[PDB]
Symmetry: C5
Subunit: 274 residues, 5 copies
């Protein structure tokens, strides 16, 4: 016999330097208040009369979600180096995928009136971001002559140049359910302190495809080995998860969105004070 | 010449600390009793008259499958500072009966006209499995909060339009086979620390199903800290749903089609600081 | 200058302990004799009148292919404490004739009108192969328990609605070429410890087929313990099914189209504790 | 207690030997000037009357984008045994404005009837980019040699049926922004030793487009010999085309839709034997 | 300061033991001569009257391309214990002219009505290439044994219904450019020990084509014993077929469309025991 090691499993409370946060963000498809009958969907998509006359109704435009998570305060005085929270990894999941596995919800029939109803399908757009400040946005639209509703943030002084990349069309994703997906995208010329990931599939009637698991972690460190650094001890979580459109019996259509869960691991770092 | 080693093959028993279990779970599409004519399928999908009047008929809603496997007893009682627990380390899993879909003579809607083969199972698919040391924790979320769910399934309590998004009060455990509808419940990503789950969804009205099968693939169940599910009360929970698509009848009524899933799980005995008070 | 090595290429005869075998298996879609006009295809798919009246015609049901390859004799008898056995370590396999589908002049249904090319083979596809040291073990599972299978195929005995899911009594061995229907039998994942199998299915009414071909890919057959299939009685079992889709005739009758599969298996001699009583 | 290291985060200015450039290139689908109503789209696609009579209207042909970026001057003396050159070692690149396609209210053909959303941009897609130390070298190859190309694009000289395959005389340099049609010119794989290019095509009449976007991906530009593009005359060439699909109007006329592309290229100073 | 190394970039000629060859192969869809109006396409596909009466017209059948490249002469004496042979170790290969498909004005069938663009090339695709030290070995297998093949292509001898599966007598060598039909012949996996081949097929009536292009990818040609194709008689065999789909005319007649393929093969001299 000899003295040797054996590994016992127990609850381990992680180092003081490491923290995890969890959050969920509900979708902002247009009906953005939980009391609303069509919460989690847009209102019926109203189409343009013409190029010149294109005025989407209130609540018909899906917008990005954003949540600001206040982390534990690290610095008593900001005058010294300072400590900052560095986001190192994230686990994220689209919640409610299985809700689409439903052929009895009222709408257009797959075949005739004896069949199931057409499920959510068409254009999809799934993106998330984790950063130490608001996601920086670039404006670009399909048509500069659309008139955007009062309750969304649109491009200022829109002109045909906004159908391409105009460097004046910039914004911060600093309000939940206010920045339309069809107007704003991540600005790749900025966002040095944010990591973002997105996938788009278009088409009129395309089948949606989504996976879900609790086994996958995305590392947030950049090419220099540094994760997002949380300015003022605030963590920004942003996303949009448009699953497709639901078609009603009358052939009116509404966007369907799903919520997203985030689990972010952060660590305390010593940072030279700007 | 010299003395040297040669490797002889033989049956090896493996150590007492490791065990393997195998199980299969039959699908729960609505007709959940093997004596039923449409066992392995739902009843005909009945669609809503309206947003307000949406009452799925009994046995038209696919539900999750779950089995609880009783593992070998490890402890005399729960009084010691440490106990032994089974740790699930890996799983091999297979959807069974995929080839049954390779059938164009089953009665139904014709591909072309009445001289052609019949349309096979297609449309929305949903395949998921989980292996854990306790029930899979579920989150409720529905397409429509005004649906009236049948008494024989577990629905969200006191549904409101908020349940079309994530309401933290809509939570459940997958603790009954063939009772929790797929369209109401999904894995809760805010919990499930002691379960591993994996899922794939493809929608669309008539989409072709795609499935693979092999006995060569093993999934490791260890988490980011190197620890597998730990089996509380020496029970292993296997959960799944495998909706292959819908079958369309000649009259255009449609039924969900599900397939069984096989599991082979490897577990090892571990010393664990006693969690039980 | 100095003495040094240079690598010269030459024909090398491998060690006596290693052998390779090559074989091809022609498809068994229904017309299984090379003299038949529709060899490599099924007969026209006849569809069910009803759930209760569903009687596939003779030769309309694709079946698995199987070949048993007799390997070199290794033992004088089975009396010693150890014996020699062939261990299958790797396989190269290819579906042959893929390019034959690149044909829009074969008579059939038109893509557009009567001036256009004809619709090529498309729809449901099913590709699988197995390499083992004994027959592939099969599980039965059908779309409909009330189908009446023809006398010339091996069907599930005393079929009941439970056979639309997994019934553990519905088991068979793939021990006859062109006799076990693909739509009735699939690999049994609860057995097959001495076989490796691999399969892919894509369904749908008219889905485009996708196939690749190369001589650059080798699949390793060693299991999780580093052991390949061990060939009982010095026999190697090769199994497959390769359904490319259906061909549609102008009258809209449809026939399954299959393709042959080539195998190149590498085996090595091993000393094995004698399993034979 | 002991002396030891701790890793402090700070703003680090990269070594003098390394530089990064950022640029964006707007699409050149035919309406190539930001004052134009249909900027970012082609004009309506006019189809051939016949094989012999096929005359695309001006600005109906999507063309490649190119930008030449002037890098810091490295050599005041070009007569030494060696010179310095900028070597492009990696690139991050993104298609911008993908989310603009997530729009079912823009006027056009209806998905179902007049109560539904309108059909989004779909059909043929073509996405490519290149990073090089000199212009991208092009090979000409067309669907039909009897097409008559307009005078505002560069096309194949003395076109003949052989140009429906590879004729080695049909060669060009991508040296004008918005003038070389995608349907006439492709990268020449027999040249381009000093460029890296990457492209993806999916055809079909009405195919759904698929596009990803992230700031997490870097492509290494070093070749098989470990050498990146070397920038002749301290000029960096960025080339691309990003056709997202076509938009269909209610009248069923169709226009190509393109999107801009962003580039972030890292370069390092290298000693090079003087040519 | 000290003596130290710095890596200077320069033009290097590889060792005398290594050579690179570049080639392109134009497609052989039926119109195989660059003077033909429809060069790069087949003639209109004529469909069978029946099972028994199926006679494809001349030049309606896409065929494989092959080029035999003469390499530098290695042995003036062929009677020693060893000879030198070229060993192919890697290949870079690209389909050329993919962008030519990004064309909706070419005359044909309309996507929607007569105001819209025309349907692009789509349907069945077949892409393969091979690099070897001798002709690619072929296996014959057809959709229908009662087809009558024309006298300008090489087909199966004494065709019988068994040729709808694998009959071991139906074997050939790919030794003539543009004469072996794709629909009759495939690589023989039971031979081809001295060739590497790679192929991809996607069928369907109207399927969208998918193709990528880059100059960044190298395929290693070494087999499982670390040996590449050895070039018998100092000849390198390049084979391919690249069927992009079919073009549909307004009358609904259809023609196959093929594209050229580029090859860049690296070879090294090896000492080989004299056979
Ligand atoms: C996303 C969703 O739940 N859509 C509903 C839809 C909406 O509630 C409605 O369009 C918003 O005003 O309503 C659907 O059911 C309708 C009935 O509620 C109504 O009584 O009659 C309608 C007849 O055209 C229709 O049946 C719908 O529009 O199809 C059901 C759908 O799920
Ligand atoms: C999933 C399945 O087996 N579906 C059957 C279907 C069901 O048995 C039935 O719809 C509900 O129990 O029955 C099908 O055959 C029918 C005949 O059994 C009946 O006599 O007449 C019907 C006429 O519309 C029909 O032919 C069906 O509904 O198509 C066959 C199908 O496979
Ligand atoms: C898979 C195949 O070869 N199919 C053939 C088909 C078969 O020979 C037949 O269905 C077996 O009974 O025959 C096709 O051609 C037919 C002619 O042979 C017949 O003279 O007239 C038929 C009229 O509908 C038809 O044209 C077919 O059924 O389309 C040709 C097909 O490739
Ligand atoms: C790509 C794009 O923005 N297309 C517009 C289109 C263009 O403005 C037009 O083709 C360029 O000359 O115009 C569409 O709207 C049209 C109205 O502006 C016009 O008053 O009437 C037309 C009736 O057929 C049509 O409604 C269009 O052609 O559909 C809108 C489209 O987004
Ligand atoms: C692949 C190709 O270029 N196809 C052409 C086609 C060919 O020139 C023809 O099939 C060769 O025999 O011709 C198309 O244009 C035609 C006119 O040239 C002719 O004057 O009238 C035809 C009326 O049906 C037709 O418009 C064609 O057949 O559509 C154009 C096509 O691109
Ligand atoms: Ca910047
Ligand atoms: Ca939690
Ligand atoms: Ca077992
Ligand atoms: Ca060259
Ligand atoms: Ca051989
Ligand atoms: Cl703005
Ligand atoms: Cl609840
Ligand atoms: Cl049985
Ligand atoms: Cl030219
Ligand atoms: Cl022959």
């Amino acid at each position: 016999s000899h003295m040797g090691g054996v590994e016992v499993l127990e609850v381990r409370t992680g180092p003081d330097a490491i923290t995890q946060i969890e959050a969920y963000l509900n979708p902002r498809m247009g009906n953005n208040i939980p009391s609303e009958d069509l919460y989690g969907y847009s209102n019926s998509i109203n189409t343009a009369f013409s190029k010149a006359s294109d005025t989407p109704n209130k609540d018909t435009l899906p917008c990005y979600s954003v949540a600001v998570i206040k982390l534990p305060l690290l610095n008593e005085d900001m005058t010294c180096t300072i400590l900052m929270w560095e986001a190192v990894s994230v686990k994220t999941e689209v919640v409610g995928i299985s809700s689409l596995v439903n052929l009895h919800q009222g709408g257009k029939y797959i075949y005739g009136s004896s069949s199931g109803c057409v499920p959510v399908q068409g254009t999809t757009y799934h993106m998330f971001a984790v950063g130490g400040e608001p996601l920086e946005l670039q404006g670009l639209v399909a048509s500069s002559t659309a008139t955007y509703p009062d309750d969304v943030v649109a491009i200022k002084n829109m002109k045909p140049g906004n159908q391409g990349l105009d460097p004046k069309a910039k914004a911060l994703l600093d309000k939940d359910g206010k920045y339309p997906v069809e107007v704003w995208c991540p600005d790749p010329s900025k966002n040095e302190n944010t990591r973002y990931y997105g996938s788009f599939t278009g088409g009129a009637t395309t089948p949606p495809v989504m996976q879900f698991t609790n086994s996958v972690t995305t590392v947030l460190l950049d090419e220099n080995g540094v994760g997002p650094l949380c300015k003022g001890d605030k963590l920004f979580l942003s996303c949009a998860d448009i699953a497709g459109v639901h078609t009603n019996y009358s052939e009116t259509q509404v966007w369907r969105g799903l919520p997203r869960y985030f689990n972010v691991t952060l660590r305390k770092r010593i940072v030279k004070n700007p």
